[PDB]
Amino acid sequence: MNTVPFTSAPIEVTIGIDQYSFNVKENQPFHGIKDIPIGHVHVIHFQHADNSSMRYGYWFDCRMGNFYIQYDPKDGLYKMMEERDGAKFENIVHNFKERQMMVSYPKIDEDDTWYNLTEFVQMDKIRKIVRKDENQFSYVDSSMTTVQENELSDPAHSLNYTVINFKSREAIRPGHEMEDFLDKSYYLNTVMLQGIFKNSSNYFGELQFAFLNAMFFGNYGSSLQWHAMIELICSSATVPKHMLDKLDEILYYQIKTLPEQYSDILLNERVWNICLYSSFQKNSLHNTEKIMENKYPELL
């Protein structure tokens, strides 16, 4: 297990680690988070008490370096840092763990929730969506716009998701206008999967990352990207059987983890109703349709 030690917590903040979260009072003797499962990506996220504007956070993989968090009184946020001096990380980490100043990543042994939400998410790909190569972790916040959003302002701070646009020449073959608009299998299989993503794992990883950025940061463009990638599959007549089975699993856990009270803003009624009840795959997402109907029937 791994550790993200904190220099201090000078300002009151709700701290997020993956799907858990806890409140740290201003100048509380909080020195970071211990027992973080090696082997998954993770996300440590913040919402300041005094201003819930800007949720913000860092995606990281403990295998890629030793990371710590220090508040920056000038820029006014908790910043992720990498300490290249391994020995110093051990001493820094060992004092705080003996003085018990750290919260334990609180994973239940029956619980595969995080593995299931991040199954196909890789840091290497995260870092191509979030351009900032001088760091091994990736910063994200609520307000970052996506490349397609910028097409419809600062390019350095965008989310470079894969543009999906159903009324685009990329999506529509000359001579197959109707066929390709009504059945997006061409765009899904030849254009996106074979052409751009190479495999369905890479596709699902971006989708899963988009959902997580939407849920954890309220990042609106991520939510758009999430719904588009779902809708692209659901609107394809011809999808590999294994992809539909995994998609159902991916979505089931996303819907299961979603705060009941955030459903009105993170869930597009048209997309979901279309996907579960009107699309080619209306009958193929059994787990997802069951949880969606028993949890958010109002939406349907």
Partner: protein, 237 residues
């Protein structure tokens, strides 16, 4: 966005535009089968594409052969319409292509958008206007060319005949809409109005009779009376 009463006069400015009406693309006669079931028989159709400024009507004749062995014909018809409009645009020189194309039905928006992706600078628009272009097939000479076609075929008409020599396009369009509205509300009566006087004839190169200015005022009033009359017959007013 959408064309309505606030911006009605944009039709007559000098940006090239076309109305596309797809109502008569896919036309059927429903009849009983020997087994007592019901079956359709398609008949020839037509795309009604019109420059409201010039009166140039590009009448694309949809022969029933284009439906053979096809499913979901009402849906195909929208995409067939879009295919043919995109072909017409592509056939025109660039200086003649429309800057906007206004569809009389919202269901044509996406078909036409998708077929015009090569033309991003052409605006595809709906309209809130209720235009009577479905009555285009009540114009004998148009109806004749459609029903006689043995193959796909485009015929070019001026739906204003020589009216623009004497009136403006705003006025020509208003006459046309009123003519077609009347033919749509009561075709027989409308045709009786138009052809009751044998001494006013339709020139071989025209669609409508050679009414003088004064006689068009009469006709236009009789057409309004007809539309008023039927309104009362309908609603019992």
């Amino acid at each position: 966005g959408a064309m309505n009463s606030s911006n009605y006069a944009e039709l007559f400015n000098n940006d090239i535009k076309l109305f596309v009406d797809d109502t008569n693309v896919y036309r059927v006669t429903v009849h009983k089968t020997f087994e007592g079931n019901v079956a359709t028989k398609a008949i020839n159709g037509c795309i009604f594409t019109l420059n409201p400024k010039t009166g140039h009507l590009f009448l694309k004749i949809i022969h029933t052969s284009v439906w053979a062995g096809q499913k979901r014909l009402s849906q195909l018809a929208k995409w067939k319409t879009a295919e043919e409009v995109s072909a017409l645009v592509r056939s025109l020189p660039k200086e003649e292509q429309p800057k906007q194309i206004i569809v009389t039905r919202k269901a044509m928006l996406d078909p036409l958008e998708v077929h015009m992706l090569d033309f991003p600078n052409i605006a595809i628009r709906p309209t809130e206007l209720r235009l009577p272009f479905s009555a285009a097939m009540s114009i004998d000479k148009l109806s004749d060319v459609v029903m006689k076609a043995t193959e796909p075929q485009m015929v070019l008409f001026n739906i204003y005949d020589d009216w623009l020599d004497r009136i403006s396009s705003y006025t020509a369009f208003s006459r046309l809409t009123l003519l077609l509205r009347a033919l749509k509300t009561n075709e027989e009566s409308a045709k009786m109005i138009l052809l009751s006087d044998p001494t006013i004839t339709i020139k071989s190169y025209h669609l409508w009779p050679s009414f003088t200015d004064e006689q068009w005022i009469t006709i236009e009033s009789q057409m309004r009376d007809l539309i008023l009359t039927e309104y009362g017959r309908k609603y019992n007013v």
